Amino acid sequence: TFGYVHGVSGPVVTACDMAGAAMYELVRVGHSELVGEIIRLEGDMATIQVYEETSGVSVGDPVLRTGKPLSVELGPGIMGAIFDGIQRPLSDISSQTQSIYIPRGVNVSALSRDIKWEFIPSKNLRVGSHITGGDIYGIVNENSLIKHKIMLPPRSRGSVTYIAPPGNYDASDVVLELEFEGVKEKLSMVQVWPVRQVRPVTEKLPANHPLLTGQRVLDALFPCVQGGTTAIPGAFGCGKTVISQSLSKYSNSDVIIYVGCGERGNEMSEVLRDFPELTMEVDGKVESIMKRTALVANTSNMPVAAREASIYTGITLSEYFRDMGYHVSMMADSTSRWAEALREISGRLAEMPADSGYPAYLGARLASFYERAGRVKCLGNPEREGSVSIVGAVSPPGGDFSDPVTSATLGIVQVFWGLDKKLAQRKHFPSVNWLISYSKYMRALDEYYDKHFTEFVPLRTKAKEILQEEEDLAEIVQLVGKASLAETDKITLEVAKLIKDDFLQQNGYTPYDRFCPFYKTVGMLSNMISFYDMARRAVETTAQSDNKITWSIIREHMGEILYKLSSMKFKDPVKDGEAKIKADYAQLLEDMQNAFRSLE
Template sequence: TAIPGAFGCGKTVISQALSKYSNSDVIIYVGCGERGNEMAEVLRDFPELTVEVDGQTESIMKRTTLVANTSNMPVAAREASIYTGITLAEYFRDMGYNVSMMADSTSRWAEALREISGRLAEMPADSGYPAYLSARLASFYERAGRVKCIGNPEREGSVSIVGAVSPPGGDFSDPVTSATLGIVQVFWGLDKRLAQRKHFPSINWLISYSKYTRALDDFYDRNYPDFVPYRTKCQQILQEEEDLSEIVQLVGKASLAETDKITLEVARLIQEDYLQQNSYTPYDRFCPFYKTVGILRNMITFYDLAKHAVESTAQSENRITWATIREAMGDILYQLSSMKFKDPVKDGETQIRKDFEELYENMQTAFRNLED
């Protein structure tokens, strides 16, 4: 996974949140050429956090390995730190563990390569980086994957790499970013405009992608059969909202069709109460998949029911508009935006599923009453 973004977009916070709350067995966190206070923050926060292992509560530091290589350390050490991290990850992988490696940031590593290459009088390529930059990046990222280990007992391990990329000025055409995007399968593009609006994580939902969606469809069909159509519908709503927002700036919201007003409102609901997360709160710092599916299901159901109500009464005298729905469904809309406040640890899976199902049924009843 590559996480490119400009300064202040929240790359380090995403890397640290993944280190704290991912369901991996082992975490390797490499601070490569970044500020020293970030490593100090990790050392301060991590010992206070706990993780549940086989019914026992353990300190998160017991599963974490830190490779500290701050910006004031020698350039040669900066180049070596990424290789040190991935070698440690492979060591634990060969024991049969699932390992996550966070590299923050690979751009500083590439800059160290450039400096060493310059001192060796090698021929520079694009922006002064050595011609073998993309080959080095590929040889690093391609060490990730799931493997069957040699020897006895039989064991399977995996390494997942999450690399933060810091392009100068947030320019994604930077050689390091371009080379990285040609290799990785998952891309989380951080957007400066979202960060300025205090929308975190500032992942732009229109430019980000994953090439693993097809591979995971079988898992979703077995465990969460409704998720794939909901995800597709969600992407469609967000894409439509992007197109409509340009029209709204020209002619205003009042001149839009009623169905378009619903699209805008549901897209806002998805952005603010589903995609936006506060990593410093107990209810929102991580989200189990059943909660993810439950929130998405209710939001998409509201969209479908509202659209159906408007379209089915468009020709009748008692025409239903978005204003009518908003007035009649104030409580439902409030409950939809409050779904994220359910705490997976405190409330538990059974209670959260029950609450989401109750809201789903209340929506069906409310729209039936409105249409009658």
């Protein structure tokens, strides 16, 4: 169980005298017990990937072999904490070591063992009863927002021989003891689960409820669904960070996880500065966002192995809370940094690469991450159903989707919110191409929309028709200067501008557009299309007659109607009431109908 170092080359350490080792077992290399894992074995020599700096490691240093793969401690004390890429609490390292630096070989327990937790049993689990994996036998009140439910670890079952009474217990106390085939397993509030293992569920279910966000361009055109898998290409100022924050604060979800893979030092600080300071309204009260959020922090100057493992740590936490019946929304900062880590390690291991230096299995690693999501029926007696949504983020070397990471992502993710370079240059925010983007959940959400709204589906169809028709008319207008256009074509161009500027564009730092509720998004679109249909009907109905109606006549006749339509973004939800906003939009529709009636 104590091997020796045979040869260090970068973060890759060759060991010897490890005949019984298995792949991806954790090892501690060196006299500082640096964290590493076995990547491959040749005879009794192991090739170890180290998660820390290897400077100073000598030939002959000891290697301590453990029997567990890279795993996360799952239990009370996660929410509000920031973890390293391999599950190391940064706030506890700072306070326990009293230094700005992270020591090499530091061993801080992932979940503090000195905190008294309030544990409440299920109050029906009698001694002698039968339990299986996933069963919930008590709750811990971490805070007023998220109740932490204590699950039996997966792959365990048996008869209950002891259950702790209501009281305050630490993370090292025995709460439940169960016996299976004569073996007595004593469990605390913390379970351990390998990061590369998928937590089992009873059934993976279709995603039929939307994950509403604050951006109209997204929800009106390319919806994301609870349990959906999407990606948002990286682009500064284009809304990448507005969606991350809005998604955390306003979205239809219970637990938020934000995982960095290769974040820049100061960008990581920005997230950490905002994390305890952002708040949300829960039930009439304002509460800190950190109470329902737990991020994983990993910067570009961290070891390549932790850069790779960060994603696995994040999704492991996500599935853990998924199995509580919560709706979990996991945001990645970058998956291109993950792919970069894979390229770096593939090179270091001297294995045959594929396109642009990436490993040929890049697609398999991304699929493994992206497919660990969806609405599920959870294991355990309570029959609860949770979900994980994944939002990926592919940093664009360009708009060419030949990019190995973009291409592999596109083949897996159901929703792709591509960010146009030209819209970014023009400071059109959020910057979404809306011609190259897609969402494959249309038919899944059609049931929802038809049940609740009935109006959105047909409005969505017409809106997409107008935007695409505008692009084709734009191509010729740039050439001939509108010298010859049909009257209907002139309306399409002008309504499409109304849509582009006053519906698909919003300033997410303003009270009025920090979050636009879906009922309002539908209201806005309903009026703009209603205008379109009435303007198109008027000119086509009166065409080839005496009192020919044109756009110039409509704009002069009811110019205040276009002003009101362009003003709809300013109704300011939450400060103003839902009942009034609906009434105000109803008035705009009545005024347009009367304006066209008097025109015709």
